[PDB]
Design a binder for these strands. Structure first.
Ligand SMILES: [Mg+2]
Ligand SMILES: [Mg+2]
Ligand SMILES: [Mg+2]
Ligand SMILES: [Mg+2]
Ligand SMILES: [Mg+2]
Ligand SMILES: [Mg+2]
Ligand SMILES: [Mg+2]
Ligand SMILES: [Mg+2]
Ligand SMILES: [Mg+2]
Ligand SMILES: [Mg+2]
Ligand SMILES: [Mg+2]
Ligand SMILES: [Mg+2]
Ligand SMILES: [Mg+2]
Ligand SMILES: [Mg+2]
Ligand SMILES: [Mg+2]
Ligand SMILES: [Mg+2]
Ligand SMILES: [Mg+2]
Ligand SMILES: [Mg+2]
Ligand SMILES: [Mg+2]
Ligand SMILES: [Mg+2]
Ligand SMILES: [Mg+2]
Ligand SMILES: [Mg+2]
Ligand SMILES: [Mg+2]
Ligand SMILES: [Mg+2]
Ligand SMILES: [Mg+2]
Ligand SMILES: [Mg+2]
Ligand SMILES: [Mg+2]
Ligand SMILES: [Mg+2]
Ligand SMILES: [Mg+2]
Ligand SMILES: [Mg+2]
Ligand SMILES: [Mg+2]
Ligand SMILES: [Mg+2]
Ligand SMILES: [Mg+2]
Ligand SMILES: [Mg+2]
Ligand SMILES: [Mg+2]
Ligand SMILES: [Mg+2]
Ligand SMILES: [Mg+2]
Ligand SMILES: [Mg+2]
Ligand SMILES: [Mg+2]
Ligand SMILES: [Mg+2]
Ligand SMILES: [Mg+2]
Ligand SMILES: [Mg+2]
Ligand SMILES: [Mg+2]
Ligand SMILES: [Mg+2]
Ligand SMILES: [Mg+2]
Ligand SMILES: [Mg+2]
Ligand SMILES: [Mg+2]
Ligand SMILES: [Mg+2]
Ligand SMILES: [Mg+2]
Ligand SMILES: [Mg+2]
Ligand SMILES: [Mg+2]
Ligand SMILES: [Mg+2]
Ligand SMILES: [Mg+2]
Ligand SMILES: [Mg+2]
Ligand SMILES: [Mg+2]
Ligand SMILES: [Mg+2]
Ligand SMILES: [Mg+2]
Ligand SMILES: [Mg+2]
Ligand SMILES: [Mg+2]
Ligand SMILES: [Mg+2]
Ligand SMILES: [Mg+2]
Ligand SMILES: [Mg+2]
Ligand SMILES: [Mg+2]
Ligand SMILES: [Mg+2]
Lengths: 178, 259, 134, 60, 143
RNA sequence: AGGAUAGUGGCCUACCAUGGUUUCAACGGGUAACGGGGAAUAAGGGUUCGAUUCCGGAGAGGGAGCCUGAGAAACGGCUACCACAUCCAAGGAAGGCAGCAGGCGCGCAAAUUACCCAAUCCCGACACGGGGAGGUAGUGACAAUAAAUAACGAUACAGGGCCCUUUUGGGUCUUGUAAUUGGAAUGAGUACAAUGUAAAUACCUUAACGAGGAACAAUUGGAGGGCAAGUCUGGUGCCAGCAGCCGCGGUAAUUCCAGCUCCAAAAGCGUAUAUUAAAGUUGUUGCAGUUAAAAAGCUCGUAGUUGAACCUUGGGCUUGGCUGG
């Protein structure tokens, strides 16, 4: 038959289901970033847990090792590219010091609210889900869309949105048309 | 298993064709021909995946049935014909001549050549022996049989094929200092000069090859193809990159400067 | 409003099939999309070719609308186009009539029914008729 | 072990439990909104009593 | 020297000794002996269908005092007879003689649970309808 | 030595020797055993699995024997027997779904008797024919990805936050409450249409329609401990039942049956079974053996395992590549 198509899981659950310290930390963290459920926090922790594992393996190698230099710099460059890592902390020791709030800062939901286009973070998600926000000339309706540094300046209302110069929406047309 | 296989699973195709996983269940099974199945390039892959002249397998058959494609100066209509190393492909409608030479990345490069260079080819001598009525002959890497060769020609030498009469113009003796491209193994596509030939009776002889950057690698004698009488003097035009292998860090640096 | 904009990229001249082939980018703001028939008319005017020598297919609209990407062919003549085209595209363009045949079940059942007859059908049915003296 | 017994009392308590209908109460928010409701209730308007914090205080 | 060989060429003694001594692990014995395949009423399956033979009722163990309401079921796959508990308040009234019931374990993986003596299975479905659905009046028994 | 084979060969025959394997486990038995690439889990070391997208092998109900052919001991080829089993005018004849779909049976356990060669490729005398190979759709909560179920105001009212200020009385800006009040936004759905396709469906785009209880209404398990969340209300009263384990139930039950409230995960949640970590409870890393389980009654002893030290060191000379600076 045809070749299999690869797929993989993008999250992992905690070993202890009930722990007040972790439950309170997650809910406090979900409320700050307007997340739908706990799985969106597990997803960040999962990809950060494997970033650390990659960093540990390179750190055991000698400095100036060809693999450590190539993949370590590439991983740092990618993290700097998405704005998670600062430009003055490209040492692979600050990579281990990264925290989940660094990643939630770079979501589309966080940037829409932090750019003043929305009143609150929960307004940001519904704006995104309702096809109002466009990055560049492309409409993006994924709240977890990770904004790159060069894409940061191009977040604005969609050109065909009611809030960004488009026509009036369904509700207004029904009222003013009577 | 009661007989010869006639299909090729997509996953089982040679990796240097660079076929995608999900385009279908099967891959083009190269026909019997001058080149081995694993070391060939079917014309369907060349006309559709490489040149992208044809959009699908139906179109490559339409191209070849109008007599456009010539391999080594003869019109070929077999869509899965196993073209191989040093083969010449002529499309006089587009006025293009190609030679199948490996690039340094291990794949068959799209190497355009002039019409003057497309009038001959090189073949590695596999064996020299006597035929019926005591007539000596040479077998090249593409299955060619040339009678009455120069009596100095021996195995592992390279001959220059007139490619229109099939005769030998001249040859290169296998010896230290000859220019070589590697046609097998993980050093496939690299170009260098012979530094030292290490003999092993009953086993496999090993050849030490020095890159233009004075990088040394070892490969089996069966993967050695003599292409020049000395360094910097190849008998055919080399593909872009000149068969010099760069490390991934060097490639990243070169790519950064180019862009 | 309208202002349909057409861009061509990856253009390859293909005298092997007597045609030019390219990727088509269509910019249609304030417009759901552009029909293949309307693209063929526009493409003929832009490149001064016969409308029947232009073939477009495989279009998809990007997310949010306002832009589509496809593939296009322009032949040197209508005769060349009719020779090197799939049947279904010529039926799309009206250059051919959809061939009418029975379903695959009927063709296969008829093929297997004829497999039980050796010789001409006229001989087989005349002999079968003779057996059924009725 | 000795195993036997009258089967006549099966479902005794559930059968005689007085049926009480659920009051038609407002729907709770779903999805992201419910996480928003819980977050404020636990970190914005804290209802603790000098160190005594209860999620479900019985009326007392 | 820790009572086991340490020489670099003593891998055979170490491999055989470990192989010999894993037989003391009862979990290991059941996997290789195939005891679930040979001895278990389910034959190693998670579930098994059967026919209810009779409603009887089992007295609970001390210090508890109650009537655990079970059924006697003859398995279709091998004809063996087992006792299966009928969970929840009054679900015994949903199960009649000569009904087809789907069984599952009690979750203690072959041992009895709680005060119920000698019962290792529970009733999951009757007549192809979930017993839980019957208890919560989501569905009605097809009869 | 011959015969046979495409060919080596006890492959077979004639004659002749007495050899061949084995405690470094032969031989035999079992396998709920096709092998591998690989899968699950994983600090390290490991444990468990691999019928199944690729490769190799084997089979076409069970055996055996063959024809044709380069290639088959082929089974959508034949011959014969066994077991099943079809039509019959009773003389005879014809079978093989572990191919696709479908049916019966088995079961805890698995979908349509659909469309097509347009793509991927294969076969043929072949640019043209064929292909249940293959592709498309149907069923599909196997698993996997992303991700709706609401957002923002207006006032009211409360607190904090400030400021006019001594407090007082205010102005006023941040939260919370509002059967307490609005106007915006959108896709689920549907739909002209275009795109998609061999033709369709669906997706993507997109006119018109499409949200206040926005009934366009999220569920599954729990609330004594482990383990997050009730000593609330009613019912029962060692009964009914719960309870993985410890335990709960004999008249205010923190555990049953319910109502309310709350907790956890959420388009998912629970149960059963297996397996992995936890397990340093299989321990090579890395267990224990006086008394918790466990030194053979004691010596000898073959295989196995394991075995004291010792043989060009030091010095000197030049010497490249690099790494503090
Ligand atoms: Mg809590
Ligand atoms: Mg050949
Ligand atoms: Mg040739
Ligand atoms: Mg016929
Ligand atoms: Mg016929
Ligand atoms: Mg034993
Ligand atoms: Mg025991
Ligand atoms: Mg085990
Ligand atoms: Mg077993
Ligand atoms: Mg007890
Ligand atoms: Mg009995
Ligand atoms: Mg049942
Ligand atoms: Mg012999
Ligand atoms: Mg022989
Ligand atoms: Mg086994
Ligand atoms: Mg088996
Ligand atoms: Mg196995
Ligand atoms: Mg496998
Ligand atoms: Mg396998
Ligand atoms: Mg099996
Ligand atoms: Mg599987
Ligand atoms: Mg296979
Ligand atoms: Mg076979
Ligand atoms: Mg069968
Ligand atoms: Mg077959
Ligand atoms: Mg056979
Ligand atoms: Mg068959
Ligand atoms: Mg037949
Ligand atoms: Mg008769
Ligand atoms: Mg039949
Ligand atoms: Mg079938
Ligand atoms: Mg199933
Ligand atoms: Mg069915
Ligand atoms: Mg086809
Ligand atoms: Mg099929
Ligand atoms: Mg598809
Ligand atoms: Mg799903
Ligand atoms: Mg809903
Ligand atoms: Mg719809
Ligand atoms: Mg629709
Ligand atoms: Mg159409
Ligand atoms: Mg509930
Ligand atoms: Mg608990
Ligand atoms: Mg608690
Ligand atoms: Mg009471
Ligand atoms: Mg416990
Ligand atoms: Mg009371
Ligand atoms: Mg009470
Ligand atoms: Mg309490
Ligand atoms: Mg409890
Ligand atoms: Mg309760
Ligand atoms: Mg939650
Ligand atoms: Mg471990
Ligand atoms: Mg134990
Ligand atoms: Mg222990
Ligand atoms: Mg260790
Ligand atoms: Mg111990
Ligand atoms: Mg101990
Ligand atoms: Mg122990
Ligand atoms: Mg004792
Ligand atoms: Mg003693
Ligand atoms: Mg002894
Ligand atoms: Mg000894
Ligand atoms: Mg020594």
């Amino acid at each position: 038959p045809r070749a299999p198509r690869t797929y993989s899981k993008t999250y992992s659950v905690p070993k202890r289901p009930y722990e007040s310290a972790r439950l309170d930390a997650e809910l406090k963290l979900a409320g700050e970033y307007g997340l739908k459920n706990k799985r969106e926090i597990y997803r960040i922790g999962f990809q950060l847990s494997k970033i650390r594992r990659a960093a540990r393996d390179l750190l055991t190698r000698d400095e100036k090792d060809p693999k450590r230099l190539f993949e370590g710099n590439a991983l740092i460059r990618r993290l700097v590219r998405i704005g998670v890592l600062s430009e003055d902390k490209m040492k692979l020791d600050y990579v281990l010091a990264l925290k989940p709030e660094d990643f939630l800062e770079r979501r589309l939901q966080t940037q829409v609210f932090k750019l003043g286009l929305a009143r609150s973070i929960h307004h940001a998600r519904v704006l995104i889900t309702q096809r109002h926000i466009a990055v560049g000339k492309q409409i993006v309706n994924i709240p977890s869309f990770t904004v790159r540094l060069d894409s940061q300046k191009h977040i604005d209302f969609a050109h065909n949105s009611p809030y960004g110069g488009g026509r009036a929406g369904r509700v207004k047309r029904k009222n003013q048309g009577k | 298993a009661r007989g010869p296989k006639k299909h090729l699973k997509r996953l089982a195709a040679p990796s240097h064709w660079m076929l995608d996983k999900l385009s279908g269940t099967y891959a083009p099974r190269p026909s019997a021909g001058p080149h081995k199945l694993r070391e060939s390039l079917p014309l369907v892959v060349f006309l559709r995946n490489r040149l992208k002249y044809a959009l699908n397998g139906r179109e490559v058959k339409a191209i070849m049935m109008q007599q456009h494609v010539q391999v080594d100066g003869k019109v070929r209509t077999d869509t899965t014909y196993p073209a191989g190393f040093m083969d010449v492909i002529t499309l006089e409608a587009t006025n293009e001549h190609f030679r199948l030479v490996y690039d340094v990345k291990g794949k068959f490069a799209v190497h355009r050549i002039s019409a003057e260079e497309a009038a001959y080819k090189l073949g590695k001598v596999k064996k020299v022996q006597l035929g019926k009525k005591g007539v000596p002959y040479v077998v090249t890497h593409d299955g060619r049989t040339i009678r009455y060769p120069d009596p100095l020609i021996r195995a592992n030498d390279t001959v220059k094929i007139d490619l229109a009469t099939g005769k030998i113009d001249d040859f290169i003796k296998f010896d230290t200092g000859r220019l070589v491209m590697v046609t097998g193994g993980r050093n496939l596509g690299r170009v260098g000069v012979i530094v030292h030939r290490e003999k092993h009776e009953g086993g496999f002889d090993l050849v030490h090859i020095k890159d233009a950057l004075e990088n040394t690698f070892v490969t089996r004698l069966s993967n050695v193809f003599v292409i020049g009488t000395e360094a910097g003097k190849p008998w055919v035009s080399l593909p872009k990159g000149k068969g010099i292998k760069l490390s991934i860090s060097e490639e990243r640096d070169r790519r950064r400067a180019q862009q | 409003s309208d202002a349909v904009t057409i861009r061509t990229r990856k253009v390859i001249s293909n005298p092997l099939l007597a045609r030019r082939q390219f990727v088509i980018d269509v910019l249609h703001p304030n417009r759901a999309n552009v029909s293949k028939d309307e693209l063929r008319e526009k493409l003929a005017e832009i490149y001064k070719a016969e409308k029947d020598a232009v073939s477009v297919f495989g279009f998809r609209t990007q997310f949010g609308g306002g832009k589509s990407t496809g593939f296009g062919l322009i032949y040197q003549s209508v005769a060349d186009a009719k020779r090197f085209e799939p049947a279904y595209r010529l039926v799309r363009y009206g250059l051919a009539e959809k061939v009418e045949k029975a379903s695959r079940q009927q063709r296969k059942q008829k093929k297997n029914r004829d497999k039980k007859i050796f010789g001409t059908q006229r001989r087989a049915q005349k002999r079968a008729a003779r057996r059924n003296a009725d | 072990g000795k195993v036997h017994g009258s089967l006549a009392r099966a479902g005794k308590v559930k059968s005689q439990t007085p049926k009480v209908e659920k009051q038609e109460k407002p729907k709770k928010p779903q999805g992201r909104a419910y996480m928003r409701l819980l977050y404020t209730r636990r970190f914005v308007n804290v209802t603790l009593t000098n160190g005594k914090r209860k999620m479900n205080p019985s009326p007392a | 020297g820790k009572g086991k060989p340490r020489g670099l060429n003593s891998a055979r003694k170490l491999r055989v000794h470990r192989r010999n001594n894993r037989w003391a692990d009862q979990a290991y014995k059941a996997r290789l002996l195939g005891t679930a395949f040979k001895s278990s009423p389910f034959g190693g399956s998670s579930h098994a269908k059967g026919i209810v033979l009779e409603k009887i009722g089992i007295e609970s163990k001390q210090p508890n005092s109650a009537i655990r309401k079970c059924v006697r079921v003859q398995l279709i796959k091998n004809g063996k007879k087992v006792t299966a508990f009928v969970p929840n308040d009054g679900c015994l009234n949903f199960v009649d003689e000569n009904d087809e019931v789907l069984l599952a374990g009690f979750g203690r993986r072959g041992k009895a649970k709680g005060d119920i003596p000698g019962v290792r299975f529970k009733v999951v479905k009757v007549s192809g309808v979930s017993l839980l659905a019957l208890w919560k009046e989501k569905k009605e028994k097809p009869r």
